[PDB]
Each structure stands twice: as C-alpha cells, then as structure tokens.
Design a protein around this ligand. Sequence first.
Ligand SMILES: *[C@@H]1O[C@H](CO)[C@@H](O[C@@H]2O[C@H](CO)[C@@H](O)[C@H](O)[C@H]2NC(C)=O)[C@H](O)[C@H]1NC(C)=O
Ligand SMILES: *[C@@H]1O[C@H](CO)[C@@H](O[C@@H]2O[C@H](CO)[C@@H](O)[C@H](O)[C@H]2NC(C)=O)[C@H](O)[C@H]1NC(C)=O
Ligand SMILES: *[C@@H]1O[C@H](CO)[C@@H](O[C@@H]2O[C@H](CO)[C@@H](O)[C@H](O)[C@H]2NC(C)=O)[C@H](O)[C@H]1NC(C)=O
Ligand SMILES: *[C@@H]1O[C@H](CO)[C@@H](O[C@@H]2O[C@H](CO)[C@@H](O)[C@H](O)[C@H]2NC(C)=O)[C@H](O)[C@H]1NC(C)=O
Ligand SMILES: *[C@@H]1O[C@H](CO)[C@@H](O[C@@H]2O[C@H](CO)[C@@H](O)[C@H](O)[C@H]2NC(C)=O)[C@H](O)[C@H]1NC(C)=O
Ligand SMILES: *[C@@H]1O[C@H](CO)[C@@H](O[C@@H]2O[C@H](CO)[C@@H](O)[C@H](O)[C@H]2NC(C)=O)[C@H](O)[C@H]1NC(C)=O
Ligand SMILES: *[C@@H]1O[C@H](CO)[C@@H](O)[C@H](O)[C@H]1NC(C)=O
Ligand SMILES: *[C@@H]1O[C@H](CO)[C@@H](O)[C@H](O)[C@H]1NC(C)=O
Ligand SMILES: *[C@@H]1O[C@H](CO)[C@@H](O)[C@H](O)[C@H]1NC(C)=O
Ligand SMILES: *[C@@H]1O[C@H](CO)[C@@H](O)[C@H](O)[C@H]1NC(C)=O
Ligand SMILES: *[C@@H]1O[C@H](CO)[C@@H](O)[C@H](O)[C@H]1NC(C)=O
Ligand SMILES: *[C@@H]1O[C@H](CO)[C@@H](O)[C@H](O)[C@H]1NC(C)=O
Ligand SMILES: *[C@@H]1O[C@H](CO)[C@@H](O)[C@H](O)[C@H]1NC(C)=O
Ligand SMILES: *[C@@H]1O[C@H](CO)[C@@H](O)[C@H](O)[C@H]1NC(C)=O
Ligand SMILES: *[C@@H]1O[C@H](CO)[C@@H](O)[C@H](O)[C@H]1NC(C)=O
Ligand SMILES: *[C@@H]1O[C@H](CO)[C@@H](O)[C@H](O)[C@H]1NC(C)=O
Ligand SMILES: *[C@@H]1O[C@H](CO)[C@@H](O)[C@H](O)[C@H]1NC(C)=O
Ligand SMILES: *[C@@H]1O[C@H](CO)[C@@H](O)[C@H](O)[C@H]1NC(C)=O
Ligand SMILES: *[C@@H]1O[C@H](CO)[C@@H](O)[C@H](O)[C@H]1NC(C)=O
Lengths: 44, 431, 196, 433, 49, 90
Amino acid sequence: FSNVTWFHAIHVTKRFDNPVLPFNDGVYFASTEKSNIIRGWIFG
Amino acid sequence: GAENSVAYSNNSIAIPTNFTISVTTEILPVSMTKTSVDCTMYICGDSTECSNLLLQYGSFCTQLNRALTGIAVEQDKNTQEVFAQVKQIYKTPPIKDFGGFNFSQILPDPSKPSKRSFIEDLLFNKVTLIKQYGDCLGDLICAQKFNGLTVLPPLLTDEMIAQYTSALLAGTITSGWTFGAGAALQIPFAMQMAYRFNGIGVTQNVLYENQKLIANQFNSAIGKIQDSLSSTASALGKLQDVVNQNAQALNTLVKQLSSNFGAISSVLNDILSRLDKCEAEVQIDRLITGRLQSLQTYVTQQLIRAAEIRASANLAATKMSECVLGQSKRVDFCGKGYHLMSFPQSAPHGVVFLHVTYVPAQEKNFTTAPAICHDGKAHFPREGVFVSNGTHWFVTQRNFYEPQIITTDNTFVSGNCDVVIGIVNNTVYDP
Amino acid sequence: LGKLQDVVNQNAQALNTLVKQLSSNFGAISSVLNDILSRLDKCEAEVQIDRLITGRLQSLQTYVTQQLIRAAEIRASANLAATKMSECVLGQSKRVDFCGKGYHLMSFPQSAPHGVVFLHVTYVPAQEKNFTTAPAICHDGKAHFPREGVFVSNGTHWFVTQRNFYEPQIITTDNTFVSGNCDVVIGIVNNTVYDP
Amino acid sequence: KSFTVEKGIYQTSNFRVQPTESIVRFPNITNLCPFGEVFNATRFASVYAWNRKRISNCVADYSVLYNSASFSTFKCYGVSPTKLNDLCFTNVYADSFVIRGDEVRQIAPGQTGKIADYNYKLPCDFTGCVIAWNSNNLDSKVGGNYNYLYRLFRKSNLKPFERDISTEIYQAGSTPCNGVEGFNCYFPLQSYGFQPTNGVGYQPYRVVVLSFELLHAPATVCGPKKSTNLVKNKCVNFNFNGLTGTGVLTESNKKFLPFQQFGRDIADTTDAVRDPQTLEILDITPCSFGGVSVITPGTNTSNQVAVLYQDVNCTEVPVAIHADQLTPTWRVYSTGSNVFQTRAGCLIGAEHVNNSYECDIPIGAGICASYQTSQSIIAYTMSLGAENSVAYSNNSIAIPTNFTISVTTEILPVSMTKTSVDCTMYICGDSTE
Amino acid sequence: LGKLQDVVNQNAQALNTLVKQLSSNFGAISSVLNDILSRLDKCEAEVQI
Amino acid sequence: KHTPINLVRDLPQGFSALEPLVDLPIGINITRFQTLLALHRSSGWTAGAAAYYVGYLQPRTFLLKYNENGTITDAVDCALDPLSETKCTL
Ligand SMILES: *[C@@H]1O[C@H](CO)[C@@H](O[C@@H]2O[C@H](CO)[C@@H](O)[C@H](O)[C@H]2NC(C)=O)[C@H](O)[C@H]1NC(C)=O
Ligand SMILES: *[C@@H]1O[C@H](CO)[C@@H](O[C@@H]2O[C@H](CO)[C@@H](O)[C@H](O)[C@H]2NC(C)=O)[C@H](O)[C@H]1NC(C)=O
Ligand SMILES: *[C@@H]1O[C@H](CO)[C@@H](O[C@@H]2O[C@H](CO)[C@@H](O)[C@H](O)[C@H]2NC(C)=O)[C@H](O)[C@H]1NC(C)=O
Ligand SMILES: *[C@@H]1O[C@H](CO)[C@@H](O[C@@H]2O[C@H](CO)[C@@H](O)[C@H](O)[C@H]2NC(C)=O)[C@H](O)[C@H]1NC(C)=O
Ligand SMILES: *[C@@H]1O[C@H](CO)[C@@H](O[C@@H]2O[C@H](CO)[C@@H](O)[C@H](O)[C@H]2NC(C)=O)[C@H](O)[C@H]1NC(C)=O
Ligand SMILES: *[C@@H]1O[C@H](CO)[C@@H](O[C@@H]2O[C@H](CO)[C@@H](O)[C@H](O)[C@H]2NC(C)=O)[C@H](O)[C@H]1NC(C)=O
Ligand SMILES: *[C@@H]1O[C@H](CO)[C@@H](O)[C@H](O)[C@H]1NC(C)=O
Ligand SMILES: *[C@@H]1O[C@H](CO)[C@@H](O)[C@H](O)[C@H]1NC(C)=O
Ligand SMILES: *[C@@H]1O[C@H](CO)[C@@H](O)[C@H](O)[C@H]1NC(C)=O
Ligand SMILES: *[C@@H]1O[C@H](CO)[C@@H](O)[C@H](O)[C@H]1NC(C)=O
Ligand SMILES: *[C@@H]1O[C@H](CO)[C@@H](O)[C@H](O)[C@H]1NC(C)=O
Ligand SMILES: *[C@@H]1O[C@H](CO)[C@@H](O)[C@H](O)[C@H]1NC(C)=O
Ligand SMILES: *[C@@H]1O[C@H](CO)[C@@H](O)[C@H](O)[C@H]1NC(C)=O
Ligand SMILES: *[C@@H]1O[C@H](CO)[C@@H](O)[C@H](O)[C@H]1NC(C)=O
Ligand SMILES: *[C@@H]1O[C@H](CO)[C@@H](O)[C@H](O)[C@H]1NC(C)=O
Ligand SMILES: *[C@@H]1O[C@H](CO)[C@@H](O)[C@H](O)[C@H]1NC(C)=O
Ligand SMILES: *[C@@H]1O[C@H](CO)[C@@H](O)[C@H](O)[C@H]1NC(C)=O
Ligand SMILES: *[C@@H]1O[C@H](CO)[C@@H](O)[C@H](O)[C@H]1NC(C)=O
Ligand SMILES: *[C@@H]1O[C@H](CO)[C@@H](O)[C@H](O)[C@H]1NC(C)=O
C-alpha cells in the first residue's frame, strides 16, 4: 500500500516523459503496455 | 453480574416450594501423548561422525530419555488411577426398569461394535486428533518420526477405558455408593435416589411423591446435554488445548532444526561435505550444543505440562471417588447445587463428568421465629424451621416446603421461654 | 515402599549425573581445568575455559530446574499428606476412598525416611443376603417411610433395618414417619404398623 | 549403561543398521575446464579493472591445481581445501588481477588498505578462495612495468565486488580544479613500479579468486569424481552434486521450477532432490528409523527377551529393519514363528496367548507381556478385572449380615534431600583464574 | 502477610536479575552491542553477537 | 514476471510473485536510472498509449505462504498495519 509515481505516454500535448530517476537501493518497474514501447533501461 | 439485593429481615425466611434436577457437564484432562525422542536421530541425522562427537556428552541424553520415560509412565499411571478405581467389571442389566430414568444415552450401545455410548460417541468427534510406516514413504507426523520424535500409544485403549466407564455406570445405577466400599450390594434405583435425596436434607417422601416428574426432568436434562455438545465444539476446550499444545511443541521442536546456532549452516550434510575434519568438528559442536539445548527446553516444558496434567488427573481421581463412587457434601465440588450423583464418560485424553444436582427453584417468603413458647417453656425443631403462613405455625424442612403441625416429636424443649430472642406464642399439639 | 525409594533413587541419581557431566568437553580441548591451564597460555586458556564454564553452568541449571520440578511434586504430595493427617488421623473422613477402600473408621500415622505411612482402618461389609423390599408401607391408607434404614422382608414379615448391618426391627411409629396418602408412591406394599 | 537390567520394557536407539557402500552421482560433463586461460594468461588485468571470467560446463579438476605453478597462498573460506574436489559449484566466477608484494594480505574478508578500499573489496559472507603466487619473472621487466595501475585516491571506499575504472581528478583540496591536474587535486590512478631486482614486498603477485556458492542452485561445474550407479531402496553414502549424507531414496512427483534444484522441508533438511544425469524429481528418507522397544524379565531370572517395532506392518518389517545387512542374531528377531501384530506395532520373540491376566510388563494398545512357567515369554490382552453382574431388580435389596475391619497401608513422600551446591567449587576446581 | 510479600518479592527480583544479566559477556569482547558494532566490522561482529 | 491483463487504468487488484532470471556480475555503482521510450514515426513522430509505474524498494520484513505446489500465493507486509504485525508475530 505504498505510493508509486505514475508515468505514461499518450498520443492525445503528446506527453513525452522519461526523465532521470534516483535508484535508491532497489527499483520496482511495472509496465501496462500493448505495442512494445517501454523496452529498455539505463543505469548509472 | 446481575445486580441483586436480598430483602434481609430479622423474622423473614424464604423457602423453596419446587426444585429442578440440573445436569452439569464438566471436563478434566487426565493424560497426554506419551512422546519419546531418540537424541542420536534428532541431533545427528544418522551420521556416524556426528554420533561420535555427541558420544562424549552421553549422560545428557540418558537424562532426557529417562525424563520422557518417566513422563510416559506417569501418564499411564494417571489413566489407571482415574478409570481403574474398581477391578470388577459390572455388566449393565438387560432390562432398564429404573423407575422412569433413562440411561440409554450414557450406557453402552450394544448395536455399535464399540462399547462407547451415544454421549461418548459425540465426545470423540468434537476432538480432532497411528500413522503406519509406508504412508510416509509413499505431513507433520512423518517429519516428526523422521527426526526421532515418536508418539508411543497409551496402554489402555479407548475401548478398555470405555469398558471401565461402563462398569462404573453399572455399579452406580445398580448398587449406588456400595460398590465403592467393598462388595457391591443392590438397591432399586428409585430408593437409591430417595436416599441421595435424604443426604441433601430433603426427606425421601418428596421423591416418591414427584418420582415421575423428577425422572422426566433428569431425562430432559440429559437430552439438553446431548444437544448442547452436539451443536458447538468449544465445550471441550481443555482437552483440545492439551492436544494442541502437545502437537505444537513437537512442531516447534522440528522447526528448530533450521537454526544455525552460529554455524555455517543447519544441515549436517552441508558441513560434512564442505569442510574437512577440523572445522567440521568445531561447527558440529555448535550445532550439537544448540540442538541438545532445544531438546532440553522441550523436555523441561513437557515436565511442566506433565505436572499440570498429573494435578488435573489427581483431581479427576478424587472426583471419581467422591462423586461417582459416592455422594459429596463438598460445595461446588461436583456441580452448582446440592449434589445427588454423577456419571463418568470417557473422552480423548480425559474424562467428562455429568454431575446431576438438586437446585431449589421457586421460593416463597414466610414469617418465622427461632422458637415457640407453649406454656413458659421454649420449643425448638429437630429437622427444619418454624414457619408461618400468616395465621398458623408449622415446622418445615428447608429445601422443600412441606409444613407440618407443631407436635412434640416434631420439636424438643430446652429451658424457659425468656432467654431466647425472637420467640413467639403458639400452642403445641400433643398426640 | 516403592514411592519413598524412588524419591531417594532420583535424588541420589541426579547428583551422580551431575558429577558425571564434569567429564564432558563442551567443545574444549579437554574436560580437566588443570590440563587446559598447564598446556595453554592466558589467551586460549581463557577462550576454552569460557566454553567449559558455560557448559558446566548450563548443566548446573538443568539440575536445578529438575530439582525445582521434583520439589513441586514433593510439595504436592506433602500437602496431600498434611490433608490426610488432618482429616483422617485428627478426625474421621466421609470422603470416599480418601483414607482407605471402605467406610473410614480411623487412621494411624507412622514415620518413614523422607515420608509418612498411614494405616487406615476401615469398615468393609462382608456377607450379603438378598431380601425383598419396598419404598413404603400403607397401614390404613397413609404411607409410612423409615427414618434410619430401609424396609426389608424375610418372606413373611416386614422390618426396618439399617443398611450396613442386618438388624431388623419391628415396624413401629418411632421407627417410621407418615407423609400423605398411600396412593402417590410407586412400589408401596400392605402391612400393619405396630403402635407402642 | 549397566548389566543387570530389571524387569520391564525399555526404549532404545538403533545401532542396528550401518552403511556398507558409497554412491556418487554427478552430471555428465567431461569438458576440461578453461583454467589455462585464467591461470596461464599472457597478461593479467590491472587491479582497478580486475578481470571477471565466467566458468561453466566444467569438470573442474583437482584441489590446488598443482600442475606446474607453485601457489604461495591458498586459503579457503567456507570450503576446506581437502573437500574442494568432492563438490559441485553453482555460480563460479574467477576474479583475476596482479598487485604488488605486501598487499596480497589485503585480499581477504575484513581487510583494508589501498587494494581492499579503492580497488577490490570482498564480503564477509564469502564462500570461495584466493590463489596467490609470485610472478616477478613474468609481470616485471627492467625499467618497471608501467601497465599495472592501482586507484590511488577515491572519495569513499568500495562495496564488495564493485569495480571502478573512472578517471575523474580527485580533489584533495577544498577548491575544485575543473577536472585537470594541478595543486591539491591529483590523478586518481598510479602506476606500479615492478623492477625485476626490487624487494619481495614490491614484486608483482598474480592473484585469482574463485567465488562460488554451494548446494543451493542447479550446479553446472562438477568435481573430478567419476559417477556410479545409485543403489535404490537401500541406504548408502549418497552424493547428489556435493551433499554427503545417509538415507534411502525414493521416487517423487513434485513440480520443480526450472531454476530450482533442491527442495527443503520444515526441518530445513533435504526432502526433494533432482538427479543430475537423469532429469527427474525424487525424495529422501532415513534408514535408521523407527523406535525399538525391548521387553525383558529381570536378568537374574532369564536372558530371553522380546522386541517391539513401533507402528511397522510386519508383513514388511524386514525391509524396515533392513534385514539384508546385519548379524543374524538380530535377523532372528526380524522374522520368526512368534510374530504378533499389535496396534502398537509388531512384537517378535513372544507367543500370543488367548487368555487374559493382570499383567506385569505393559506393552501398549491393551497388550502386556510376562515371563511364564512352558518356560517362555507370553503376550496377551490384559484382564480389566473379574467379570461380574449385579442382579438388579426393582424390589430386591442386598444387605450385609457381617463385616470386616480391614487395615490398609498407604505411603506418601513428604520431603527429599536438602541438597546444596557451590558453583565455584563445582565449575572451577579451586583455581583462582 | 508473608506469603503475598514473598510472591511480590520473587516476581520483582527475578526481573531485576534478568536486567542484571545483560552485563555478562558470555565470552564476548564486551556486553554492550554498541561497543561490538563500533569496534568490529561485519565478520567478527557477527561471530561475537 | 509477465502476466495477461485486460485493465487499462491502474494496478491489478491481486497478487503475483516474481521469479528470478538473471544475476549479472557487473560490479557497477548505481544511483540514477532511466527508461528508453520508442517513437512511432511517419518532431515528426507519435507515441502510442503506454504506462510505466516506478516504486522504490525498502528494507522490510515480509511473511510468505508457499502453497502445496511450491509457489507463493499470499504474503504479509509486517509493519504495514497492526493486523499485519500480528499476522507476522503469530
Ligand atoms: C414444579 O416445576 C415443574 C417444572 O420444572 C412444574 O412442572 C410443570 O407443571 C405444569 C402444570 O402443573 C405443566 O403444565 C408443565 O408441563 C410441567 N413442566 C414439566 C417439565 O414437567 C411443576 O408444575 C411445578 N410444581 C409445583 C408444585 O410448583
Ligand atoms: C431413552 O432415550 C431415547 C432417545 O434417545 C428413547 O428413544 C430411542 O432413541 C434411539 C435413538 O434415537 C432410537 O434408536 C430408539 O428407537 C428410540 N426408542 C423408542 C421406543 O422410541 C428411548 O426410548 C428412551 N428409553 C426408554 C426405555 O424409553
Ligand atoms: C406470650 O405469652 C405470655 C403469657 O401468655 C406473655 O407474657 C405476658 O406478657 C405481658 C406483657 O405483654 C405481661 O403483662 C404478663 O405478665 C405476661 N404473663 C406471663 C405468664 O408471662 C408474653 O408477653 C407473650 N409474648 C408476646 C410477644 O406477646
Ligand atoms: C393394599 O390394601 C388396600 C386396601 O386394603 C387395597 O386397596 C383395594 O384394592 C382393590 C383392588 O385390588 C380394590 O378393589 C379396593 O377397592 C381397594 N380398597 C381400598 C380401601 O383401597 C390395595 O389394593 C392393596 N394393595 C395390593 C398390592 O394388593
Ligand atoms: C556511487 O555514486 C554516488 C554519486 O555518483 C556517490 O555518492 C556521492 O559520493 C561523494 C563522495 O564519494 C559525495 O561527495 C556525494 O555527496 C555523494 N552523492 C550522493 C547522492 O550520495 C557514491 O559514493 C558512490 N558509491 C560508492 C560506494 O562509492
Ligand atoms: C462374621 O465374620 C467373622 C470372621 O470374619 C466370623 O468369626 C468366625 O466365626 C466362626 C464361628 O462363629 C469361628 O469358627 C471363627 O473362628 C471366627 N473367625 C474369627 C477371625 O473370629 C463370625 O462368625 C461371623 N459372624 C456372623 C454372624 O456371621
Ligand atoms: C501517496 O500514498 C500515501 C499513503 O497511501 C499518502 O500518505 C500520500 O499522501 C500519497 N501521496 C500524495 C501526493 O497524496
Ligand atoms: C420477599 O420480600 C421482598 C420484599 O418484601 C420481595 O422483594 C421478594 O420478592 C419476596 N420474595 C418472593 C419469592 O417473592
Ligand atoms: C394457613 O394454614 C391454615 C391451615 O389450616 C389454613 O387454615 C389457613 O387458611 C392458611 N392461611 C393462609 C393465608 O394461607
Ligand atoms: C425486628 O426488626 C424490627 C425493626 O427493624 C423490630 O421492630 C422488631 O422488634 C425486630 N424483631 C426481633 C425478633 O428482633
Ligand atoms: C441374589 O439374587 C441373585 C439371583 O437371584 C443371586 O445370583 C445372588 O447370589 C443373590 N445374592 C446372594 C448374596 O446370594
Ligand atoms: C421371618 O421373621 C419372622 C419373625 O418372627 C419369623 O416368625 C418367620 O419364621 C421368619 N420367616 C423366614 C422364612 O425366615
Ligand atoms: C417390578 O418389575 C416386574 C417385572 O419386571 C413387575 O412385574 C413388577 O410389577 C414391578 N414392580 C414395581 C414396584 O415396579
Ligand atoms: C549423460 O549423457 C547421455 C545423453 O544425455 C545420458 O543418456 C546419460 O545417462 C548421461 N549420463 C552419463 C554418465 O553419461
Ligand atoms: C601452464 O603453463 C606452463 C608452461 O608455461 C605449463 O607447464 C603448465 O602445464 C600450464 N598449466 C595449465 C593448467 O595449463
Ligand atoms: C535376583 O537375583 C538374586 C541373586 O541371583 C536373588 O538374590 C534375588 O532374589 C533375585 N530377585 C528376583 C525378584 O528374582
Ligand atoms: C498393513 O496393516 C493393515 C492393518 O493394520 C493390514 O490389513 C495390511 O495387510 C498390512 N499391509 C500388508 C502388505 O500386509
Ligand atoms: C486364539 O484365538 C484365535 C481367534 O479365535 C484363534 O484363531 C486361535 O486358534 C486361538 N489359538 C489358541 C492357541 O487357542
Ligand atoms: C497443483 O498442481 C497440480 C498438478 O499440476 C494441479 O492439479 C493443482 O490444481 C495445483 N494446485 C494449486 C493450488 O496450484
């Protein structure tokens, strides 16, 4: 019952967002997706 | 509880005009599971090099096995002292002419292959808990057995305990309290009941005057017991707690094999495959110490529980002696009320007593006085108390309203009628 | 005298196990302090003697715990013995089988090593005879019941007798009492009631 | 722990069955391992960029790899070197590099210094070991090799198994110098000087670290041991991918996930295993199992006995005793004419008698035993007591005409010995230290 | 009222021994966890703890 | 873990247990990270409807229920709420 930051890209503006996020000793990444858009990650 | 207030007064009494024959079920544990433990199998999972390390302790496990053996013998003791009070198997009579009383629910059912009765059959179903080998090869019990934990069977089986109980019931209903004190005499049941009644301060006349009603009350009460422990299962709480504690301590004992106790692992095969002689020895010493310590903790808890169960079993033996084999004058020892009699029923790892008792029911106020001044001398009653319905004066026994006219045999005389306080004036009939 | 001997044996055996547990190493190089303190310097003598101390203190605690258990048992038995001394030596007990198989008459105490022995002397009825009985007696329409004892018959006459000894008495008004008509009661029979 | 046992029944442990043969069963991998590439490498990596090599599908050869290279320090954590052949490792990784002389001590758990803080850190929970050996004859040349570098400065120490190949200028002073060289801000890497004629503490040492984890995941590397054929339904000294135990094996039908290879019960011991060569799921049970009770009349009366095997089904007790391997003096008690299946288990060495008596020696489940005189042990259902029947009738009484004055002796303990213990005298045999 | 006071005293005294037993080392370098966890690294802090 | 779903807005109403796959020995300090989006192209681009959720892990004590088949079917987050705390203790 935590709070997770939602990000999404929708055509509709076009809402292009994929900023840099902190990686604080672990990340849980979930994608509700249909057309193979959320595909890869950078870490550093 | 309910707020209440008794209308105390220096000259007012309250006497019952009617009664109830209540039946109260109360449950005592007697025995618990005779467990046994092999240290070698538990601590050292059938590895010889761990057995040799353990061997230098030696006396610890002799001590533990001795303690658990003592516990098991103590349980068989407890069952013996509770149920084997009499070494004469009185078989029940075939014809149930007990003056209206119906014991079919408590007496053995010959149709059933077992000698359990209806009530005993119910009691064995409200408690939940023999695993032959080959079942485990093909569960909690299997893990327990694989780790050296066995459950020895009780010496007396349930059929034999039920046979003892049936003998006790037959003696109680055919002979009364006489079969406890040596040879079992015989007595028609309604007379024995008359005299259990006399024992509680009500004359035998009241039973014979209300024999059918009293038998009806007893039968109805037995039926209510049957329903009450056929509906809910929390009635047998104590026995189930005994079973649960005994089956749960073992589960913690096996679950404690997963602890490292500061070692590299908790599986002996891991240590004995990854390490050479030297450090395998020094780690296996840690594991052995930890597992032996947990074994000792389990055994100590078992000793505590065994002492508790022995206390309960001694109480059950006392109740079997003083309430089944006789009528107890001790208050609230064998039911809320004046004790008439009791019946035993077996149950898994314990016993159930149906205590049937006299409870005065319908009270009426009366004006009373301690004495009667006839002609200057004071009269006191032998049995009962002076009572008044407003106009006349009678003697009556307490726990049933049965007024009698004042006569010389009803009473006795002692001194002049001035010393006593509260005395009143009335004539004393002379037969 | 099994129980007393078991007490003695357990007490003399726990001590023997306690001394026998001084031979355990508990993971040390030896079980004799002199060996460790002669073969080792300060450092490792300390670290091994800690193991030995922990083990021996643990065994001591085990012994003391067992002694506490046994002491609780013995206190229960002693409280029972005090109750028996009070209720059977200092008096006569109506409790059944508390102070002997039978109707209790009296008891004598005798001392014994670490315990007590009670000679309970009791009354046991011996030679029983069958009789025909009835709960009541209808004299002239009224029912008669006995005060002490029971109505009994030798086939021809009717007597009152006290239970645990056959001592028949002729039916009289002081032997019995009267309560109501002689219809309500079940099993009543017909007989005269002598009037002194 | 004595000779003159008294009359009774005694539980005992099981010294009966002992193992006789050993079983080894490792997978079918014969590829000699790529150890020449990590040990016999022309160039090792600089410590700040230590080279991690994956190793898989190997018959990893013997303990020290004492072929030609004489290894200075070979100290192993979690695994004894001697057993190093007997095991099968899950996830092996070879961490290779070269450092100077005196710093070889730093490659171990809990160490610290230049190497173990800026270059290469190990965990405490480390299972594996560290082969270190001098290589001055190779990794040093005249004028000193300026190829082997170490991280001279870092703003914080490393975490275990973390690499750092950055080259940002380390600001020793509080004033940043925008990433160039200057005063109070220095280049974080420093090159070793390995002359061929310099002290022992400055000679280049080749180090490799084999890091792995044992007996928790599907093994891929296996030791040099040759497999055998498992002996089933009989207890051996099995060896399934490294573990060493004792116990009968049996088939099973558990649904193992592909990434799982072991299965543990509540007790944390192995209750499910997957055979390496044959892909199948099995389960394990011990063989020293079952309680054994021994019934004896008191020695000084005889030496005959009887034996109760708890909860066994003695149409198949000899397979439970394992009566294919034991002295015959026990096997006579495994099968015979005098067998009796009580609800408590099976009894051997006593004849079942249809009578019923008050009994001396309890057995269980309503069965007792005794030594009767026809000189032998008998087992029977006890007698609860004399059968009796009271002639109840609605108008018949029984009254005593005579009595007895009985005297009954009954014994209660009251006290026990008031013991006392001095800890100091007991624990510490009058030694002050 | 000796018996009641003995009950109270035993119950309040066993607790006092329980807290007083936190001062024992049991063979460790100290009896305060902060000491061990400040003076030692992971490995030997684990083995002493 | 990969699963089928026919919900469009927010998280599923249920519970799934993640399996391992990989355990790469990269030896890399990580403090920041990022996601790699795609462009449907035909600034001349369009983006399909996609949604990603990010949640930071925390050091917690959990309780897990392994069913008879050996897969996690239920769990408890100790210190979530008092009820879960008691499920943890008991
Ligand atoms: C004493 O109490 C019993 C019930 O406990 C009474 O029995 C009831 O009497 C009435 C009328 O006489 C009947 O309608 C009921 O059917 C009876 N119930 C039962 C269970 O028997 C009895 O009447 C009372 N007697 C006196 C003198 O008060
Ligand atoms: C005693 O109680 C039972 C009720 O439990 C009376 O009725 C019998 O109950 C059992 C089980 O319900 C039946 O198998 C019998 O067929 C019932 N008998 C009759 C005549 O209906 C039983 O009758 C009572 N005993 C007497 C002598 O009346
Ligand atoms: C009970 O009866 C006696 C005598 O019948 C009463 O005693 C008399 O009491 C009155 C005073 O009330 C005196 O004047 C008489 O002298 C007494 N006579 C005798 C023979 O004692 C007595 O008072 C009566 N008790 C009550 C409560 O009325
Ligand atoms: C006991 O005696 C009474 C009277 O002496 C008997 O009552 C008579 O019984 C008969 C029937 O058997 C009736 O015809 C009479 O009318 C009754 N007379 C009276 C006064 O009650 C009674 O039957 C006798 N009891 C027995 C068992 O014989
Ligand atoms: C991993 O990277 C981060 C930043 O890239 C390091 O954290 C910084 O460390 C320096 C000193 O070493 C500090 O001046 C910064 O304030 C830190 N920033 C943050 C956000 O923590 C971190 O030290 C690196 N991890 C290791 C083990 O070195
Ligand atoms: C009651 O029992 C006692 C014995 O317990 C009987 O005493 C015996 O009586 C016979 C003949 O009267 C003698 O030969 C015996 O010597 C007596 N034995 C003892 C120990 O005293 C007594 O006779 C019995 N009395 C009755 C009325 O039955
Ligand atoms: C996120 O969830 C937590 C608890 O559910 C809540 O306290 C917090 O307010 C939420 N964030 C926002 C912006 O509301
Ligand atoms: C007896 O008297 C008091 C008050 O006078 C009354 O409350 C009580 O109900 C009476 N007892 C009975 C059984 O009615
Ligand atoms: C009291 O009992 C007597 C007995 O005959 C009776 O005459 C009288 O009517 C009764 N009075 C009351 C109020 O009950
Ligand atoms: C009882 O108490 C009342 C008033 O409390 C008093 O009038 C009466 O005299 C007393 N009777 C006796 C016998 O004490
Ligand atoms: C009483 O009667 C029964 C059978 O009628 C008989 O077996 C029994 O022996 C008799 N009692 C005595 C003491 O004889
Ligand atoms: C019964 O007792 C009476 C008392 O006199 C006696 O006359 C009669 O003979 C006795 N009958 C038998 C069978 O004992
Ligand atoms: C006693 O039982 C018999 C038959 O069982 C019967 O004939 C007789 O009438 C009964 N007598 C009484 C008082 O119940
Ligand atoms: C390994 O290889 C073959 C083919 O998979 C297989 O039949 C065999 O049983 C395995 N074990 C050995 C020792 O060859
Ligand atoms: C490594 O190289 C030397 C020759 O330089 C050779 O003698 C030795 O056999 C090699 N060892 C391995 C494992 O390749
Ligand atoms: C045991 O044997 C000894 C000597 O052999 C003998 O003195 C003693 O009576 C025997 N005890 C029993 C109960 O047989
Ligand atoms: C196992 O025991 C049961 C009764 O306990 C028996 O019926 C069965 O035959 C036994 N199994 C075999 C193979 O005999
Ligand atoms: C014992 O009883 C069983 C069952 O009735 C019977 O089969 C067997 O022949 C009997 N054996 C002897 C020696 O009486
Ligand atoms: C467990 O596996 C078996 C066989 O695949 C299947 O029948 C059963 O439904 C499964 N049960 C659960 C709770 O997954």
